[PDB]
Amino acid sequence: MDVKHIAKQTTKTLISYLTYQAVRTVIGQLAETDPPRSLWLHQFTSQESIQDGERYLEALFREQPDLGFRILTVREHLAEMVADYLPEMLRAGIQQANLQQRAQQLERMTQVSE
Amino acid sequence: DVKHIAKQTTKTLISYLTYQAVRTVIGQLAETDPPRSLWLHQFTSQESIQDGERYLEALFREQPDLGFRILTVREHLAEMVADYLPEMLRAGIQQANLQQRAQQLE
């Protein structure tokens, strides 16, 4: 199979997710220093969340570019903090989820005989 | 919180790889059992707006052999991708931020 395609697409998904986690973080920071801007950023994201992180940020920059810049910085820091954990967590997570899926289906199968 | 973040990130990745594994099995079925390939494509088109684990539970109710197959495939996809991610994510987020900043210098 095309591992390069899947690795790239996986990476794009990851960056989009961390972008949105960065948006949540800045919302929280604005709570400590400037509460009206927290609500604005939350509301903007409700109609603007349904898109790739890069398209969301371009939308944000048109309206509040100080916030767009803070998010670039936070998302880079979040990525630096999590990146090296991801391989083992993914492998362990998929092993655990697979076990649970199999055990549940087997329990279903033997329950349909009881 | 870094710990909550790396966990939630992981959940998101597992969901994504689950749906990638679905496409793999659709492709395999396109060879061995075209009507079931179509069936699985159609099911997935209606059941994908949920976490991968809930998708699998639903699939297991209908076509359990396909659920079992997707579990094995997603494990393989994880193994094929996982060790690229620390580099791809760092390099990717650096280039994406460079692009954003170059754009907004306009």
Curated annotation (Swiss-Prot), chain B:
Out of the domains of life, which is the source? Answer: Bacteria
Q: What is its main location?
A: other
What GO molecular functions are on record for this protein?
Answer: protein folding chaperone
Q: What subcellular locations does the record give? A: Carboxysome; Cytoplasm
Q: What processes in GO biological process is this protein linked to?
A: carbon fixation; photosynthesis; ribulose bisphosphate carboxylase complex assembly
Cellular component GO terms held in the UniProt record: carboxysome; cytoplasm
Question: What are the entry keywords?
Answer: Bacterial microcompartment, Carbon dioxide fixation, Carboxysome, Chaperone, Cytoplasm, Photosynthesis
Q: Which family does it belong to?
A: Belongs to the RbcX family.
The free-text function statement in the UniProt record for this protein reads: An RbcL-specific chaperone. Required for assembly of the RbcL8 core. The central cleft of the RbcX homodimer (RbcX2) binds the C-terminus of a RbcL monomer, stabilizing the C-terminus and probably preventing its reassociation with chaperonin GroEL-ES. At the same time the peripheral region of RbcX2 binds a second RbcL monomer, bridging the RbcL homodimers in the correct orientation. The RbcX2(2)-bound RbcL dimers then assemble into the RbcL8 core (RbcL8-(RbcX2)8). RbcS binding triggers the release of RbcX2.
The record's note on quaternary structure and interaction partners says: Homodimer. Interacts with the exposed C-terminal peptide of RbcL via its central cleft, contacts a second RbcL monomer via its peripheral polar surface.
Name the UniProt record assigns to this protein: RuBisCO chaperone RbcX
